[PDB]
Write a protein that binds this ligand. Sequence first.
Ligand code: ADP
Ligand code: ADP
Ligand code: MG
Ligand code: MG
Lengths: 362, 335
Amino acid sequence: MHAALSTEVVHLRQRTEELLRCNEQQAAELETCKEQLFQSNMERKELHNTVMDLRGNIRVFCRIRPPLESEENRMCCTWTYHDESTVELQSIDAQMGQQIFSFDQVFHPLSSQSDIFEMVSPLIQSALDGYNICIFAYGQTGSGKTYTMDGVPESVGVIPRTVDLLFDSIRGYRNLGWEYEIKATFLEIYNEVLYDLLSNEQKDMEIRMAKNNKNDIYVSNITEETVLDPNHLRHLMHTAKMNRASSRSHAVTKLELIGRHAEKQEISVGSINLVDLAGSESPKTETKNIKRSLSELTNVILALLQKQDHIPYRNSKLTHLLMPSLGGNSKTLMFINVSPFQDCFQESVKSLRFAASVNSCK
Amino acid sequence: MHAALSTEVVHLRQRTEELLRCNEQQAAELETCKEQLFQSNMERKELHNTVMDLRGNIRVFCRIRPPLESEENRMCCTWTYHDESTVELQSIDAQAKSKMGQQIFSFDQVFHPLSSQSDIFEMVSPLIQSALDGYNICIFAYGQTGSGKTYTMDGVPESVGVIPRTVDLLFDSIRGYRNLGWEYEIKATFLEIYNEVLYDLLSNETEETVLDPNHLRHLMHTAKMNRATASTASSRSHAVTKLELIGRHAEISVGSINLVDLAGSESPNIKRSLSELTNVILALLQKQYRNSKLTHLLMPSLGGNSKTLMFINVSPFQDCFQESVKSLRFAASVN
Ligand SMILES: Nc1ncnc2c1ncn2[C@@H]1O[C@H](COP(=O)(O)OP(=O)(O)O)[C@@H](O)[C@H]1O
Ligand SMILES: Nc1ncnc2c1ncn2[C@@H]1O[C@H](COP(=O)(O)OP(=O)(O)O)[C@@H](O)[C@H]1O
Ligand SMILES: [Mg+2]
Ligand SMILES: [Mg+2]
């Protein structure tokens, strides 16, 4: 019947016209809501940045690790916590002035990995909002550096926790229209010489100005993996640590967050630089450059603090590598790891001595 | 053939199922968006608290009231909002931008004339829950007559304000300390001032605890009514409202609440209490009392270790311009 079809058409055009209409109102609401969400996050980002500014763009921490179940009769020095920020160490040698230092926070032998991450988590957000972060673990060998950054399968550290935070955040960000991409890169620094950790073929790399920014950095010939998913990253990390076989080398692991918002044509890029510094201990029993680097690094932070105008980042491979992350907007976390034992008293006092020169900068 | 019109019935069935799927697609994106937008608003407001708590012990909010349903003939000046906390006013006449032509001030928050009573109280909220943690909160209303002070502190039975709204939460909080055990006693109080002569909003010529939510809500409205002031018979009265609290774990958590509705800030009597409050306040901020009955009276639920809060009410009218600028100036001065 032609009349049936004719009637089904007229109805069809009716449902189509009603749907096109109701369909254009959603498009309209979706639009404003989109705009107000972008605008809202934007302010949220700024409100977050203010809080980071108020707690400090450069904060120093202290972490005396618990003693190992295998060597304990080496009477740990005498530790006293004058408050959750100030700590003092005395030696058990029967008779300097005193040895007391202030931090932004002090973690004792019972502070869990989870507890230290809580000092870092806020920064994973800043990196996602386009800021650069640097996280160091400074101290003598055996004091706690590696266990703090990487950790142990039994109890994980800063880096593994950051990746879980990253992917969880990144995943959520999608609901805002941001598509994030992570650039992974791992490297080492023995004698002012850079070594890639995702390859074996020796190749000479070097720090050079970046394409679209003479202020940014670029390491030529290094492996820069574009993370596919957390499996891909887990593979990369395990693979990295693999070839890392030391306490006289600087291990840097950089994750660069490239956020791309398509419909708003806005781009965001921040970076996390997790550094497992080399032993700060003094030579006893040739290690020229290792004392250079560490001092250069601690001088650049001290400069950054007193707002020194022209800073010589190039005076060292490391300080040159992290230069764009030691800049203005940047935030820097510094974990001073320490050993409780007697034999480390003088060494431990050396480490801690950075806490005084940091705030004496006022 | 004409049965060839089955071509269009088919072609249409698709457009139909097309716009149908596309209908259902936008409804999902729009649900996620409102969802996310709501998460993004919460975070923003909490970080905003952390910021205000991190810097000072005194918040300043600015509130611009919309034109009353009866003032379609009053001219307004040009208002400009640059942020959520930066507002500027420009006079209507040219010769006005001839002298320091830039009136722009910054506060912890600026409320548009279309801001709901709930939007306001939402900034105050964080301070009520703070009283049960031991502090002395202090809420103020400042501005000329016809600005929004009373409407903000109290409100209208159709639209409740801060003083009422607190109450609600004040309890919903105790319903939370009464879990493993803790008991509270709401010591309410109601007074006022006229010309340095304190009266009372309860009896006629006076602290009674509260043992019933609506009970507190009663002596509250009683006071509201006992507050018999039709316009300038209230242009010089300071409507204070003490509300001390105490709690012992079921070791006596003492807090407070000091809601105030100051007198018109514009030119007139004495009104020194204000020029006095200002000094007392700027001096506290400077961080280093009986010049007015007011200051002296609430000279403890202030000072150090107490979170205070001030509202600056303004009218969007051109004839108010100097008075407004006078009010923003003051606030800014705190700023
Ligand atoms: N906080 C800690 N808790 C438990 N073990 C720790 C802790 N810190 C360090 N260790 C132990 O120290 C040894 C090597 O750790 P680490 O301190 O990172 O060396 P380095 O200080 O040279 O980086 C390991 O046996 C590790 O388990
Ligand atoms: N934010 C507002 N929204 C709607 N009306 C308001 C607002 N603020 C004040 N008003 C109106 O202004 C009039 C007087 O209010 P109010 O500001 O309390 O005066 P005063 O500042 O002298 O105490 C009332 O009619 C009130 O409804
Ligand atoms: Mg190590
Ligand atoms: Mg009034």
